[PDB]
């Protein structure tokens, strides 16, 4: 059985969040918490909050053993962007993309 | 020596205000490079305190800022009087050291290595 959580429209950009999200996938659920507490990226308190949420949906909703779970899927999709402008020089604006992310981690124990 | 990202006078003023506050509170939280450099400042300033003569009283006041400690029972000693009176009595047998640096995690706004420098 699998347990998932998502975080939709997180204001961290998708390229910046997929760095730290590559560090934790495939790894067991206990040590993935320890990686997300020690990397000093901006995304590390956000994926950790989502990994807490999917380990909680495992214990509560599906009654899994949260001690032995492994992070199967850990991906971040693109969300809707906020298109901002920026005045540079000589009356000439340039677009700034405030990108958002849908962060999704799923967790399981590998059994059916 | 390290330049700490500042001018010759901005570094000098930063480094003796950071050495005074490590006499007031005896353990302060700074960054790692600013604690590597105030380490040699305050240890050279406890060396002047273990002497205790008038000639090195004048030399410890080259460095120390004019900060007044509110001690217990509402008594007030300066940071110059607290250097030759309390720290100088603690380390009168020890031949060095006088500080330690305990590393901590990065800050939130930076990846600045936080550090507690203590007075041992």
């Amino acid at each position: 059985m699998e347990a998932k959580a998502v975080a939709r429209t997180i204001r961290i950009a998708p390229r910046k969040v997929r760095l730290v999200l590559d560090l934790i996938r495939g790894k067991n659920a206990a040590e993935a918490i320890a990686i997300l507490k020690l990397t000093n990226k901006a995304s590390s308190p956000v994926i950790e909050k989502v990994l807490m949420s999917a380990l909680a949906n495992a214990e509560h909703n599906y009654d899994m053993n949260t001690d032995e779970l492994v992070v199967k899927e850990a991906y971040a999709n693109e969300g809707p962007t906020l298109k901002r402008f920026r005045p540079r020089a000589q009356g000439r604006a340039s677009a700034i993309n405030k990108r958002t992310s849908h962060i999704t981690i799923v967790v399981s124990d590998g059994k059916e | 020596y390290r330049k700490l990202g500042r001018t010759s006078d901005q570094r000098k003023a930063m480094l003796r205000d950071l050495a005074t506050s490590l006499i007031i509170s005896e353990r302060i939280e700074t960054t790692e490079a600013r604690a590597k450099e105030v380490r040699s400042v305050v240890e050279k300033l406890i060396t002047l305190g273990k002497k205790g003569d008038l000639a090195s009283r004048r030399n410890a006041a080259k460095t120390l800022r004019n900060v007044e400690i509110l001690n217990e029972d509402e008594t007030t000693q300066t940071a110059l009087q607290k250097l030759f009176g309390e720290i100088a009595e603690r380390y009168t047998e020890r031949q060095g050291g006088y500080t330690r640096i305990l590393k901590q995690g990065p800050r939130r706004g930076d990846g600045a290595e936080s550090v507690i420098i203590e007075l041992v």
Partner: protein, 48 residues
């Protein structure tokens, strides 16, 4: 000054193969708490 050609999806992904990030220290705190960063004193949720 300007790129004469666009970079492809293949050439872009070959460039950023060293655009990675490392796993940190991760040593246990033997007194109490969770994993601390190596050679660091803990602040929260640990006894280092």
């Amino acid at each position: 000054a300007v790129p004469k050609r666009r970079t492809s999806k293949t050439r872009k992904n070959k460039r950023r193969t060293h655009f990675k990030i490392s796993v940190p220290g991760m040593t246990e705190c033997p007194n109490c708490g969770e994993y601390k960063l190596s050679h660091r004193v803990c602040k929260n949720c640990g006894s280092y």
